Amino acid sequence: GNFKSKLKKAMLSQQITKSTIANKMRLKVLSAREQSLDGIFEETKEKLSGIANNRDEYKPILQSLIVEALLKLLEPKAIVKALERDVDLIESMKDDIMREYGEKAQRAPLEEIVISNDYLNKDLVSGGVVVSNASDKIEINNTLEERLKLLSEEALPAIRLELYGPSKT
Amino acid sequence: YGAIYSVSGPVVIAENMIGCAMYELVKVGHDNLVGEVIRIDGDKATIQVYEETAGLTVGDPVLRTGKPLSVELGPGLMETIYDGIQRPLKAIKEESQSIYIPRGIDTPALDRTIKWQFTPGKFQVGDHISGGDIYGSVFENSLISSHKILLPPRSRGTITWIAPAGEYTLDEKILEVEFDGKKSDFTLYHTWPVRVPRPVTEKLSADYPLLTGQRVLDALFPCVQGGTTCIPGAFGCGKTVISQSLSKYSNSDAIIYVGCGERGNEMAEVLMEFPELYTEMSGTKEPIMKRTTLVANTSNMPVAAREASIYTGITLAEYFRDQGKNVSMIADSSSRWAEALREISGRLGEMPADQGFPAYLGAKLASFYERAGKAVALGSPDRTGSVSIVAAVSPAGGDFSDPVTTATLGITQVFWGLDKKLAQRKHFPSINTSVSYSKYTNVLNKFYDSNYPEFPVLRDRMKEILSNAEELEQVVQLVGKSALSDSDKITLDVATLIKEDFLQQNGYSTYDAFCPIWKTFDMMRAFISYHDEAQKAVANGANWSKLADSTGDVKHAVSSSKFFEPSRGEKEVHGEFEKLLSTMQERFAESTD
Amino acid sequence: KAVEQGFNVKPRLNYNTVSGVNGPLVILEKVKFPRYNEIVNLTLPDGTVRQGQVLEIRGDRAIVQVFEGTSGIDVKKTTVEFTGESLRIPVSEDMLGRIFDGSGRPIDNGPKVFAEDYLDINGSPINPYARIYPEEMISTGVSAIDTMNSIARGQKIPIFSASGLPHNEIAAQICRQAGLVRPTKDVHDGHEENFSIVFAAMGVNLETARFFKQDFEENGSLERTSLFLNLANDPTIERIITPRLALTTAEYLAYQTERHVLTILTDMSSYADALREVSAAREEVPGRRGYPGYMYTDLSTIYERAGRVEGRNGSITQIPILTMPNDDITHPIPDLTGYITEGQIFVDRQLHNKGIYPPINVLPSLSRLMKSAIGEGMTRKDHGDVSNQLYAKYAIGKDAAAMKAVVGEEALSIEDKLSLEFLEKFEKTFITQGAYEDRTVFESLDQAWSLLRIYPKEMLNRISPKILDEFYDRA
Amino acid sequence: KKAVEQGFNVKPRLNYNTVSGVNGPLVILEKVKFPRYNEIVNLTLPDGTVRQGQVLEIRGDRAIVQVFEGTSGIDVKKTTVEFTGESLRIPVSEDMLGRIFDGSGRPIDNGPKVFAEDYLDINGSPINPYARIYPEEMISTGVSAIDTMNSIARGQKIPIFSASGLPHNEIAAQICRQAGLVRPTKDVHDGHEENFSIVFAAMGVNLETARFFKQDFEENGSLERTSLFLNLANDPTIERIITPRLALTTAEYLAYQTERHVLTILTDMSSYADALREVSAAREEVPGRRGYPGYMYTDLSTIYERAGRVEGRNGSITQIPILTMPNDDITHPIPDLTGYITEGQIFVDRQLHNKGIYPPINVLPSLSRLMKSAIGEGMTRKDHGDVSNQLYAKYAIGKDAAAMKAVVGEEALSIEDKLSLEFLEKFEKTFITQGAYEDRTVFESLDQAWSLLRIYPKEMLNRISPKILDEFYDR
Amino acid sequence: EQKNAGGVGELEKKAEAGVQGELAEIKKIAEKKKDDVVKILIETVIKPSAEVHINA
């Protein structure tokens, strides 16, 4: 028994250390894969910020995002918040967005879209706009950073089936 | 901004209250009765008013405060009696000389006029600080010396100015930290919402026993510093003895006694009692009131006060846990708190689930209990605190069918359930050694193996004897003792000896008032070895009637072993028990032949 | 010291806007700034005045419970003048000696009480720090009470009793025999050995009212008692405020005049019934048995106005008789009284059927502060252990009787047979007591010892051996 | 091909600042655009705290969002609630084995979010009754009292009924550490050909036990096969309803979309029922029997019946839903309904636990209805069924003869009963009694059972078939 | 006990060595497929599904 207690302690502690080390290694592999995925997402975010800069091709993207937000909100008068750089673009595309919402949805053309003076944080939002109902109560977020945030959660399985392929299912 | 729109008792439905948050304090009426919202309906906000609502009229202003029900933590609350809302009762009596607590009495929860000595601690100017970081130390009592004042858990930033050593009242600016550009201004006290647990870095495993004194509690169903229990709340003994025992001897560096729903005369007893409990406490005989807040809350006081009484108590206990003090929080009669929840729901109108209790009773008890962990405080320097609930549960008419006890049983690791038969026999303490349990028997083995190696084996033997003999008694009371074998007679008789001399404990005499762990272990050894000697002797020829007659002296010795005055110290009490056990063994060896 | 602040006239808004009336509560509309608890002097079309009380204001509506019932009220002609203040009983030291109707009107031939102060009936919370623990025992004389359930001066201790049991006789006996075990002095003056009872008969049949009146007359207590009678034929919501009226007069008497008062509240089960009626006509969420959810608080406010106070020589003992229905303690009235009141005297039916008086059953009876009004320096030294021993052996005897019923007498050990003999002699000679016996606690303890001496000294195990060796063999 | 490419579309989420009302754990919105019924929301507090909530009811343009993590702090003006477009759905992948998950699906350990293979819906779908197939082979649990003579078959859903304070919550850890197929024990071929896993699900466990589970699965090797879904007692109760659904969805994934078997554990389903009461009363539903909602049986079945083998897919979910006896009575709705849906019961008995036995399995009432499927020549040894039968019979004989030892004396018992007392002592102390960390292979446990039954002569083993005795009794 | 401690240290080192291969494979796969995953994510984010909610 004098040897039995300490030797059982030795075997139990060796098994515990082996199990803990194995768990740490498995979590390390999983966390390394997650860090690689986060690096891919960070490259995607930088690419989105870069794509927002080319205004010539970004204007259709902004108009379509505003149209999608207005269609989802489905209200006849909406307030749109955008960065200071895109205020002129929104003002120029107001009529086109009104007409498109009058055609994308079978509603009448939008009564009035007002660009808010509370500009979005240019240091965080890389692009897009955050539409809001006439009372600024029911607001939809359509910023490119927030869209990528939604996508990074709604398309993890597609990312896996793209990068790795079917494993054992 | 606001205005009353309905009154129905504690429920006062204000209006124009748009913007108020749920559970937010909101002064009510021109008397500024203190109330909190519990339902928001557009403008309106149903407020429970914590007061005698009589006299309120529509149009009475209800001015928000924007802070949840907050307890004023900090030095000064160590020695003081508090009401459920943390009203200092003695301060109320002093400022308002009448014997009545005036409606809507402001009195700060902590004495502002007192000037506490203060030492600067560790952090210096320009040094970053975080929530829970100790930045000072105040000499509160001779028994809570170095009450380490600590930064509020949420706030953080870099220090820009820290006051030097000296004396400061409660409001004095002690520390001025800067976060972003807005530099918060910190004083010697800080509030905290009682409804949210005080955050900790990490909750460890409670593994050092809370020596509660009563023999059956420490031996059969041990409790642990940082655990949780249910003393039965019976009159005379059980609750009454355990409260004083854990107050005086349990080595809990701080204590909070929150008597929610306790009868007024019982509190008047407690208030005249705790100032007089230095009789046998360690150190240099200081009153334990220097070491215990108590949250007095008589039943007559309004419902919401009873509901928030144990929240205030447990937030104070969490505060004293965040300084590394092994605080214990004796929540007396939590069934009264559950009744308060029942009737506040009834006023509120929501559909009750069980016996009229609200459905969320289980979740509410879980939230109140799970703040009982032994945890490291949140900020540097690292320090290990531990709060341990002791929630008396008045059993009412029923035994365990009452939904409060049933919902509690799924949470508390330790449950010293009452035994009606032992109470009717006036067998104190009267806990039921068949339905009680302690999920802390196995975690404590780390402690037992170092100090008392045979303690778990002896406890298992004691339980086995008691259970086998209760089985046997359930038959002999129906048939008779004639047919019992000698081994059966020994099991039954040793069970009677145990139940009368080990489990039973006066709790009032100078001996056995607080049975320390070593004396309890030695008596466990004596009784178990007596049973083993009897069983081994009758395994040989000797019939048991003659053996009992011949070793009545040994039986009386092991029975009167309880009389050993624990103040003699382990050095000689253990010697007495060694002598007793040796004479026991030699007498049984003699009488075997 | 002057109360000259009262010389002001506040004209009272007089409505005619009774929206509707159902059950005992009228409902009012178009009120201008209603107060939550202000009473209302609503006048019926007959010209009579019924004193209501606002129950819950809401905007310009005010549900008003109406004392004296709602029969005869209407909508077209009922006028409800609002007094601006809550119910305030005119209180004085001259009320001592005359009989008040339930709602404070003096049914005695004398005039209205010439009050020197108006106390709110709801009182106010007594600062628990300012409260002082009641330790002076009162010798109620009932041996079943003084020995094993000792009432201490300031304690609350309801006499739980079945319907039809003689709880009234027990309460009258306790009034007749009340007195501290170690009084201040022998003389009536200086010692003040007379409790100035304040008795509140609420929902009692008129025979009980006559019994209490003539029993106070015979004893001479009627010169120092304020009988708040609210009989059976008296209204059913007036029972809400009769206990509050009695307790606020008791508070005036004990705390503000340093007098010693024993406040009986008879038939508080009827109070719970009245509360149920009001809170079931309010469409409230009901509690365990249809009773209001808030019964605990509005019974604590009745009970917890008892006990001594620091700096005042007065004290409010109170013994609220409680007609527990169907004779089960877990009924929500006795179950919610056992919570609030420290201890209870359980008047038990099957003991009464066997002819024992008083039919007090010890095991369910309790006094949660008996432990401090005993021992040395107050009553006999051995009181605390004798009480425990009597309780334990009574329980053992009852268990032995149950076994004897279930299983033949053979299975009973010698201890069980001795316990059966002890229980018989107990119920027949110690619990049993004449209606005027007045057993002082010392001769009660002597009887208890002459009873316990049935057992061998080795068998009185709950008695400390010192008390045994000192008292057992004295004989 | 994989059709999961549909997940690349981005769906912007509306963010309503219109929380008109707040009531208990509910918040009530207005002017909502098509509010889906069951729909997770990220409710933002005024200070910026995100607090998940689940839509509980819709009416026109009003959605009664039920909020996790309490409700305190939710105002009417500044709080903004954002609708995620779909109901709650766990992200699943074949490599969550080894992640201790929180109640709401978020990994609570230091690891990262699961690289989801799929986002399976929580409630899943009922298993096609025609697509079930009968449980066939043993799923060894390492516990001697359970493996031999309360055996569990792949697909059976057998509970562990347990008293309030019994160590059932440690038997769960023991099973989860020691569970496994008998194929590796068979040693005739590769037993790891078809992998095994476990998906533990603790519901309502206090932190002193959740940390015990996490530590005891990390320290031992059981984590690389377990998906420990811990939610605490003070974690939001809606998460307590979610957790069993979470664990069963993970189990359905691992057992059908992949192929590995799984022995899912549901700890303390009584606490899950307690949380279901809160959900039911939140919807203002009237309480059914005992306070539990009348549809208790439906939402218990929709958990239990998500288990069993499947035609085609090789995997199989084995449930062992542990539940605490509310007051140690089978008649309680939760044990009654669980035994009414499950395939048996495995008691843990207070009486044995007070003797210090571990595990305190009470064999006499415990039974596995479809045990006979998992017992035979192919799986376990061929003598397993008769060993179980004989052990149960001799244990019953031992129990009643231990009852008679006190009635007819030890010497008057027949030699069968004397041998039965000896067998019962050795049984309860060596066979049922198992070290907390002692893994006993079913073959080894049967060897102990034989070493225990050879107390009796071959003639007294009437229950065992002679063809088995003639080759197993002597060895 | 000493052998168990040494084996624990050697097992930690061997586990790090074993996980190094898997981490290297993960980095290689990420470096190979990043240029395509980023392109797909950018196309999905920048291309909106302008469509009135069903129940228009």
Binding-site positions of B for ADP: 236-241, 428, 505
Chain D neighbors (3+ CB pairs < 8 Å): A, B, E
Residue A138 sits at the chain E interface (C-beta within 8 Å): no
Instruction: Please say whether the beta carbons of C180 and C136 come within 8 A.
Output: yes
Cα–Cα distance between C262 and C260 in angstroms, integer?
7
Cα–Cα distance between D33 and D39 in angstroms, integer?
13
Instruction: Please say whether the beta carbons of C63 and B14 come within 8 A.
Output: no
- Direct distance between the N- and C-terminal alpha carbons of chain E, in angstroms, rounded to an integer: 73
Question: Which residues, in sequence order, are bridge partners of residue C292?
Answer: C286
User: What residues of chain D lie within 8 A of the CB of E48, using their CB?
Assistant: 10
Q: What is the largest CA-CA distance in chain D?
A: 85
Please name the residues between 49 and 108 in chain A that touch chain E, using a CB distance below 8 Å: 51, 61, 64-65, 67-68, 71-72, 74, 100, 104-106
Q: Do chains D and C touch by CB distance (3+ pairs < 8 Å)? A: no
- The residue of chain A nearest to residue D110, with distances taken between CA atoms, is A27
Q: Which technique was used to obtain these atomic coordinates?
A: cryo-EM
Interface size A-E, in CB pairs within 8 Å, comes to 109
Interchain CB distance below 8 Å, C307 and B264: yes
Which two structure tokens, joined as six digits, stand for A72? 């989802």
Residues B443 and B497 in one domain: yes
Task: Kindly state the helix (H) or strand (E) to which residue B532 belongs, with its residue range.
Answer: helix B517-539
Distance from CA of C389 to the nearest CA of B (A): 8
Helix runs in C150-304, H state only: 167-177, 188-191, 206-219, 242-251, 268-281, 295-303
Last residue of a domain, one of B186, B208, B234: B186
Distance from CA of B363 to the nearest CA of D (A): 6
Q: Do chains E and B touch by CB distance (3+ pairs < 8 Å)? A: no
- The residue of chain A nearest to residue E13, with distances taken between CA atoms, is A21
Residue closest to D275 by CA, chosen among D321, D229, D304, D240: D240
Cα–Cα distance between B297 and A81 in angstroms, integer?
54
Residues B228 and B371 in one domain: yes
Residues B351 and B278 in one domain: yes
Binding-site positions of B: 236-241, 428, 505
Radius of gyration of chain E (CA): 24
Last residue of a domain, one of B152, B169, B186: B186
Cα–Cα distance between D236 and D238 in angstroms, integer?
6
Long-range contacts of residues B268-276, Cβ cutoff 8 Å, at least 24 apart: B268/C128, B268/C131, B268/C132, B268/C133, B268/C134, B268/C307, B269/C133, B269/C369, B269/C372, B270/B294, B270/B296, B271/B81, B271/B296, B271/C128, B271/C129, B271/C131, B271/C133, B272/C132, B272/C133, B273/B244, B274/B247
C51 DSSP 8-state letter:
E
Find the domain containing B445 and state its range.
Answer: 439-593
C-beta neighbour count of D435 within 10 angstroms:
9
Chain C neighbors (3+ CB pairs < 8 Å): B
Cα–Cα distance between D10 and E42 in angstroms, integer?
11
Residues B410 and B448 in one domain: no
Burial B515-534 (b: 16+ CB within 10 A, else e): bbbbbbbbbbbbbbbbbebb
Interchain CB distance below 8 Å, B351 and D285: yes
Residues B340 and B463 in one domain: no
- The residue of chain E nearest to residue A162, with distances taken between CA atoms, is E37
Q: Do chains A and C touch by CB distance (3+ pairs < 8 Å)? A: no
Cα–Cα distance between D391 and D148 in angstroms, integer?
10
Whole-number Cα distances in Å, D62 to B20, D32, D37, D41: 21, 6, 11, 14
User: What residues of chain B lie within 8 A of the CB of C303, using their CB?
Assistant: 300
Calculate the CA B75 to chain-centre distance: 21
Query: What letter represents residue D283's amino acid?
Result: R
Residue closest to A57 by CA, chosen among A113, A115, A127, A121: A127
Cα–Cα distance between B254 and B320 in angstroms, integer?
7
Residues B220 and B352 in one domain: yes
Instruction: Please say whether the beta carbons of C271 and C290 come within 8 A.
Output: no
Task: Kindly state the helix (H) or strand (E) to which residue D416 belongs, with its residue range.
Answer: helix D415-426
Residue D36 sits at the chain B interface (C-beta within 8 Å): no
Residue closest to B134 by CA, chosen among B116, B144, B119, B145: B119
HSE-CB for B556 with a 13 A CA cutoff: 6
Residues of D with CB under 8 A from a CB of A: 2, 4-18, 31-33, 80, 91, 93-95, 98, 109-113, 115-119, 218-221, 223-224, 257-259, 437
Residues B171 and B132 in one domain: yes
Instruction: Please say whether the beta carbons of C198 and C360 come within 8 A.
Output: no
HSE-CB for E29 with a 13 A CA cutoff: 19
Instruction: Please say whether the beta carbons of D414 and D404 come within 8 A.
Output: no
Interchain CB distance below 8 Å, C305 and B300: yes
Please name the residues between 446 and 465 in chain D that touch chain B, using a CB distance below 8 Å: none
Cα–Cα distance between D268 and D162 in angstroms, integer?
9
Q: How many domains does chain B have?
A: 4
Last residue of a domain, one of B370, B405, B438: B438
User: What residues of chain D lie within 8 A of the CB of B461, using their CB?
Assistant: 356
Interchain CB distance below 8 Å, B58 and C57: yes
Report resolution (Å) to 1 decimal: 3.8
Interchain CB distance below 8 Å, A26 and D9: no
Question: Which residues, in sequence order, are bridge partners of residue B159?
Answer: B177
Residue D7 sits at the chain B interface (C-beta within 8 Å): no
Distance from CA of E40 to the nearest CA of A (A): 9
User: What residues of chain E lie within 8 A of the CB of D10, using their CB?
Assistant: 44-45, 48-49
Which two structure tokens, joined as six digits, stand for B161? 């100015």
Of D8, D9, D34, the CB nearest to E55: D34
Cβ contacts of residue D372 below 8 Å, gap of 6+?
A: D385
Cα–Cα distance between D234 and D206 in angstroms, integer?
8
- The residue of chain B nearest to residue C84, with distances taken between CA atoms, is B55
CATH architecture of A39-165: 2-Layer Sandwich (3.30)
Cα–Cα distance between A5 and B406 in angstroms, integer?
40
C-beta neighbour count of A65 within 10 angstroms:
26
Residues B388 and B517 in one domain: no
SS3 state of residue B37? strand
Instruction: Please say whether the beta carbons of D79 and D117 come within 8 A.
Output: no
Cα–Cα distance between B339 and B345 in angstroms, integer?
10
Residues B264 and B241 in one domain: yes
Of C34, C342, C372, the CB nearest to B263: C342
Distance from CA of A73 to the nearest CA of D (A): 7
- The residue of chain D nearest to residue A29, with distances taken between CA atoms, is D111
Cα–Cα distance between A127 and A136 in angstroms, integer?
20
What angle separates helix B334-348 from helix C295-303, to the nearest 10 degrees? 120
E-assigned strand segments in B17-147: 24-28, 33-41, 44-48, 62-68, 81-82, 116-119, 128-129, 137-138
Residue closest to B259 by CA, chosen among B363, B347, B323, B340: B340
Interface size B-C, in CB pairs within 8 Å, comes to 202
Q: Which residue has the tokens 């409700």?
A: D71
Of D94, D109, D119, the CB nearest to A157: D119
Distance from CA of E17 to the nearest CA of A (A): 10
Please name the residues between 141 and 160 in chain A that touch chain D, using a CB distance below 8 Å: 141-142, 146-147, 150-151, 154-160
Of D10, D33, D34, the CB nearest to E45: D10
Residues B84 and B105 in one domain: yes
